[PDB]
Each structure stands twice: as C-alpha cells, then as structure tokens.
Design an enzyme around this catalytic site. Structure first.
Site, short mmCIF file in Angstrom:
data_model
loop_
_atom_site.label_atom_id
_atom_site.label_comp_id
_atom_site.label_asym_id
_atom_site.label_seq_id
_atom_site.Cartn_x
_atom_site.Cartn_y
_atom_site.Cartn_z
N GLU A 35 0.73 -1.20 0.02
CA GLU A 35 -0.18 -0.03 0.08
C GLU A 35 0.92 1.31 0.11
OE1 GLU A 35 -2.95 0.46 -0.41
OE2 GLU A 35 -3.76 -1.79 -0.11
N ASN A 46 -7.67 8.94 -5.86
CA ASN A 46 -8.57 7.76 -6.38
C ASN A 46 -9.37 8.75 -7.67
OD1 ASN A 46 -9.18 6.58 -3.32
ND2 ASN A 46 -7.57 5.86 -4.62
N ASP A 48 -12.30 8.50 -8.28
CA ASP A 48 -13.57 9.19 -7.89
C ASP A 48 -13.60 10.18 -6.80
OD1 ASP A 48 -12.82 8.26 -5.22
OD2 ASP A 48 -14.44 6.69 -5.08
N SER A 50 -11.89 10.52 -4.03
CA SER A 50 -11.34 10.18 -2.72
C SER A 50 -9.85 10.06 -2.63
CB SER A 50 -11.92 8.84 -2.22
OG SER A 50 -11.55 8.17 -2.80
N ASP A 52 -6.45 8.11 -0.56
CA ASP A 52 -5.89 7.15 0.49
C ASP A 52 -4.73 7.56 1.20
OD1 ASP A 52 -7.73 5.33 -0.78
OD2 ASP A 52 -6.22 4.37 -1.85
N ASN A 59 -8.75 5.06 3.17
CA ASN A 59 -9.76 6.07 2.06
C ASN A 59 -10.76 6.84 2.72
OD1 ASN A 59 -11.25 4.69 -1.09
ND2 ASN A 59 -11.10 6.92 -0.28
#
Ligand SMILES: [Au+3]
Ligand SMILES: [Au+3]
Ligand SMILES: [Au+3]
Ligand SMILES: [Au+3]
Ligand SMILES: [Au+]
Ligand SMILES: [Cl-]
Length: 129
Positions: A35, A46, A48, A50, A52, A59
């Site tokens: 990650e 991301n 969309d 959002s 992380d 998220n």
C-alpha cells in the site's frame, strides 16, 4: 516516516494488530509494504475524488475526513491527516475498524492481489518480536 520491515512489525504488534481478526502480523506488514512502501506520509488520489492516506492507504470515502470527498463518511472519526503521522496509532485503530467491517483484509485491494495466499510470514522472518 519510512519504517523498516521489522520496525513496522514491532510497532504493529505493540498496537495489537498481530492476529487481529485472525490476521497474522505478516499479513499486515505485507499490506503496508504494497500500500505505502512503509511510508507513513503516502497519499494517493482515486478516480472518484477520494484519497488514500498513510501506511495502510485508508480511504476518505468511508473512514476519515479530508473535507474534499463529497458525500463521504468519517467512520474512524478522525482527520485523514492523522493517518500520516510518524506514530501509527491512528492508522492501526482505524485499520481495526476496517478489517472488522465484514470482508476482512479484502478491503485492501493490494492485500488481496499481492499478499493473500502467499507466504506472508516472510515479511516478519528474522525480526526480534
Ligand atoms: Au505471519
Ligand atoms: Au470522508
Ligand atoms: Au468530505
Ligand atoms: Au476474515
Ligand atoms: Au506506534
Ligand atoms: Cl508507532
């Protein structure tokens, strides 16, 4: 902060992640490796809108507030910036909520795709714990 592999393993254990929801410590270290490459300040946006955050790439769509993810929740009741700290407490506490939400560590796509079913003990092999 960029952790060493055994350093992270020990911090994760002190904070109660080893065998949490049945996931051995190597699972958690492997997830962190793919990650964030063990970097607490890692952020990724991301498609969309959002983002992380942190060593486990938690998220903003569900788990933290960053003020810029419309219609999102904050289920860990924390600012997303708290997941970037050198102290991993806030990331660990939130990860415990995440892995208890029903799908286990499959919540972390990189865990499913690069850790699940592999020899995850290798990630803690050799470490003083
Ligand atoms: Au293990
Ligand atoms: Au949010
Ligand atoms: Au928001
Ligand atoms: Au499970
Ligand atoms: Au810690
Ligand atoms: Cl820590």
């Amino acid at each position: 902060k960029v952790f060493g592999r055994c350093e992270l393993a020990a911090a994760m254990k002190r904070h109660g992640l080893d065998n949490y929801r049945g996931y051995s410590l190597g699972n958690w270290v492997c997830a962190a490796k793919f990650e964030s490459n063990f970097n607490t300040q890692a952020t990724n946006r991301n498609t969309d809108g959002s983002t992380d955050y942190g060593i486990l790439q938690i998220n903003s769509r569900w788990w933290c507030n960053d003020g810029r993810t419309p219609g999102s929740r904050n289920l860990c009741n924390i600012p997303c910036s708290a997941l970037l700290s050198s102290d991993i407490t806030a990331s660990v506490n939130c990860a415990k909520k995440i892995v208890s939400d029903g799908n286990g560590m499959n919540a972390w796509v990189a865990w499913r795709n690069r850790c699940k079913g592999t020899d995850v003990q290798a990630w803690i092999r050799g470490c003083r714990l």
